[PDB]
Nucleic acid binder design. Structure first.
Lengths: 61, 96, 380
RNA sequence: ACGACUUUUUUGCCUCAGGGUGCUGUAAACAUGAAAGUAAACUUUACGAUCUGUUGAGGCUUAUCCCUAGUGGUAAAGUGU
RNA sequence: ACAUCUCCCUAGUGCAGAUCUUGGUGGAAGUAGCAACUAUUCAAAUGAGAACUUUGAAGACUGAAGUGGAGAAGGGUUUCUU
RNA sequence: AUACUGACGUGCAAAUCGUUCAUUUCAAUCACGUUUAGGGGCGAAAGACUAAUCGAAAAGCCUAUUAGCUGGUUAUUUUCGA
RNA sequence: UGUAGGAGACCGAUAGCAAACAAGUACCGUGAGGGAAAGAUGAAAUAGUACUCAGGAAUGAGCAAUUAAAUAGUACCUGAAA
């Protein structure tokens, strides 16, 4: 189902597929999205978020 | 319908199997015990419990889990296993 | 042509086919022969294996290199709850072998006996035995009289009391014990007198006696030929494995000769061990059953922490020299020696000096918990 | 190997827990303790491998260890004669 | 659509086999076998039906000499949406 | 491509896999373009190689080549018969 | 040989032109080249399976229905043997 939207989300953010957070609820509202413009709206709302980097520290070094 | 609190010694049950299947077996064994005990063919294993069992990773599941079993109805009947965090296992027994 | 060098064949032929035993319980193949002059008496006794311990024994034997000193020897422990006799059997000799004439029973039999004649005691209505048991004493006497008149061998039906043990099962072990001794009338008298009462080991054996032991061996399932028969391994380079025999027979005759060993069942075999000396016959009531003249400490036979997979001996027990077939929790059948034994061993008197009761779970440091607590002192 | 066999089905049995027995080797935690020295105050304050004390401790011990009428459990009721 | 034994002309005319040819089909048999490449689990959605569709949560691996980006030859619409 | 005469050997492959091993600034390796063609080419030479085909490639024809040799060589009854 | 006629004591779909069919086609080969398989409902589909019921769907059944005939149902003539 959400394939397309996830691929577009990667492009919109400038970020790897592995880092995209799609809210597990309100999936229908995401499913209706069908354009880069729609992804921008969802991102504005809060329904797609970029995950942080998997944290890594030079401290110990 | 009834509510129980048990402690399952996962270490005894899991004893036989290889590292590769160890954590899977601990999850599988939870499903098995809870169904067998509570008399349902349907056991929902909460994500919190799943997280706790897998927390120390595939080589060694935690030795003991305190699980909470919940009889629910709406075939019809089922049960959910929910996890209880604990300071120490010592001195805890079965309860209802 | 002939093989280049010669060795004995691997493994005895004399136990082939090496298939599984029919029954968990042992069976006497043959009894001692009936010397007329001796009084009536039992020839066999049923027991459970509890484990092994070691013992320390002083040696009389002269002209030996070992001579005077005490020696340390392995020994087995066989718990023996007192047997209960329930029936009398009379056999008669025919050219086509022994045929049973009749059997006479006691006036009661306990639940532990009864359970054996069912598979599903819980599910059953427990209706076995009750109406035969009723029938009046004249009837019993008539059958006894018929037995008395014609029968040539009399055997007694005995059973174990598994509730007087720590073992899981409650279906008793029933086993027949032949009586050897005097006249048929005396033999019959002795069994009648015994009948519904309980029979302890001390009535059947004596200190220092030589005994035959019949037991089913430890199981292993199906094992490879090397393990099962002792065959030397093939060299490493070998293409289709190494742990297997390299020929199973010549071209002629054009069949696999049976004598070549092949893979298969190992263990769960019937075995008769001969000539094991009994070092001590315990007494249930005594607190000092494992004590000696050298030790003088109050203690029971059950070792520290209990026997592995058998726990706590609580009845009477036999401390037997050496080892005897089969596993922990297994029934063992004791049998009298076929011929009375005339060896310098068989005369000998074993004044045992020390019996270990330390742990057999890990390497024991103490003979009792009381010793352990004393050794350390105050703990949390 | 699968069958098969051995068992038990409420004075049982499973289940945890306590005790027993061992196995490992002395947990975390805290100390205006010890510690090679080091540095910086107008004796006191910093860092510190490691060590000692509370500490024969802590952890584990039937899954094919032992004991316990200690806890809570103990369904299906099918099928053949 | 078929005969012709009334007589007789005529022939690519009669098969068990050629490791024959061609087409079909068994026993072997529900068997050999479905083994490389560290390894998955829980919950939700969709649906008649989900171990291997989708989503979340974990746990993992590849580990910049990469299953990452680009490109060449060859392929050729394999692309995308529905 | 040395050794394991290891895995596989009705293969994962009509030469694959694992481990071991030889090779690395030169008589070095690769790409692409280009040159030489069948009693011919090419060969730091094994009769090697020339598209899974080599002590004479592949394709079609002369050609249904030819074979004192092998296999096969089809209804009945009746008569004489080596 | 190309094309047009006319023929037959010729073949009858494993035959006869390789080819009765969308055949020098599909397919294979780097290439020269190699190179197939596969005809038949019924008088009439301007008779090609209506309708109900059980099915998620395929399908099935019917007291329902085209036909002279559907055990002629698009694998459609007949329908042998293994």
């Amino acid at each position: 189902s959400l394939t397309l939207q996830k691929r577009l989300a990667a492009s919109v953010l400038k970020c790897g597929k592995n880092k995209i957070w799609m809210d597990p609820n309100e999936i229908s509202e995401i499913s209706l999205a069908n354009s880069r413009f729609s992804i921008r709206k969802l991102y504005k709302e809060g329904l797609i978020l970029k995950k942080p980097q998997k944290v890594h520290s030079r401290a110990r070094v | 319908p009834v509510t129980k609190f048990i402690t399952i010694n996962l270490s005894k049950l899991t004893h036989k199997v290889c590292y590769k299947r160890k954590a899977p077996r601990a999850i599988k064994e939870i499903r098995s015990i809870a169904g067998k005990l509570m008399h349902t063919k349907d056991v929902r294993l909460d994500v919190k419990l799943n997280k706790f069992i897998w927390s120390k990773g595939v080589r060694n599941p935690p030795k003991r889990v305190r699980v909470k079993l919940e009889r629910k109805r709406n075939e019809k009947m089922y049960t959910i296993v929910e996890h209880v965090m604990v300071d120490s296992y010592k001195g805890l027994v079965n309860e209802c | 042509s002939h093989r280049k060098f010669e060795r004995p064949r691997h493994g005895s032929l004399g136990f082939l086919p090496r298939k599984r035993c029919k029954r968990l319980r042992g069976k006497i193949r043959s009894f001692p022969k009936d010397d007329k002059e001796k009084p009536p008496h039992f020839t066999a006794f049923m027991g459970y294996k509890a484990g092994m311990t070691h013992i320390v024994r002083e040696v009389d034997k002269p002209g030996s290199k070992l001579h005077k000193k005490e020696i340390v020897e392995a020994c087995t422990i066989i718990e023996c709850a007192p047997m209960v006799v329930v029936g009398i059997v009379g056999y008669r000799e025919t050219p086509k072998g022994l045929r049973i004439l009749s059997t006479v029973w006691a006036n009661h039999v306990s639940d532990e006996f009864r359970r054996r004649y069912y598979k599903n005691w819980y599910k059953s209505e427990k209706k076995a035995f009750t109406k035969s048991l009723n029938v009046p004493e004249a009837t019993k006497n008539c059958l006894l009289k018929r037995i008395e008149k014609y029968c040539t061998v009399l055997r007694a039906i005995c059973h174990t009391q598994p509730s007087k043990t720590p073992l899981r099962m409650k279906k008793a072990h029933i086993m027949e014990v032949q009586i050897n001794g005097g006249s048929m009338k005396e033999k019959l008298e002795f069994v009648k007198e015994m009948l519904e009462k309980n029979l302890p080991v001390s009535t059947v054996f004596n200190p220092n006696e030589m005994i035959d032991v019949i037991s089913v061996t430890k199981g292993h399932g199906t094992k490879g030929v090397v393990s099962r028969y002792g065959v030397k391994r093939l060299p490493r380079k070998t293409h289709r494995g190494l742990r297997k025999v390299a020929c199973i027979g010549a071209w002629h005759p054009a069949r696999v000769q049976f004598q070549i060993p092949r893979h298969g069942q190992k263990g769960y075999f019937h075995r008769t061990e001969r000539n094991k000396k009994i070092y001590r016959i315990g007494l249930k009531t005594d607190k000092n059953s494992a004590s000696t003249d050298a030790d003088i400490t109050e203690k029971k036979i059950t070792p520290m922490g209990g026997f592995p997979h058998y726990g706590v001996v609580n009845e009477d027990f036999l401390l037997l020299k050496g080892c005897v077939a089969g596993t922990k929790k297994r029934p063992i059948t004791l049998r009298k020696n076929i011929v009375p034994q005339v060896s310098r061993d068989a005369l000998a008197q074993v004044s045992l000096k020390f019996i270990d009761t330390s742990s057999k779970i890990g390497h024991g440091r103490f003979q009792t918990s009381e010793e352990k607590v004393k050794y350390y002192g105050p703990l949390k």
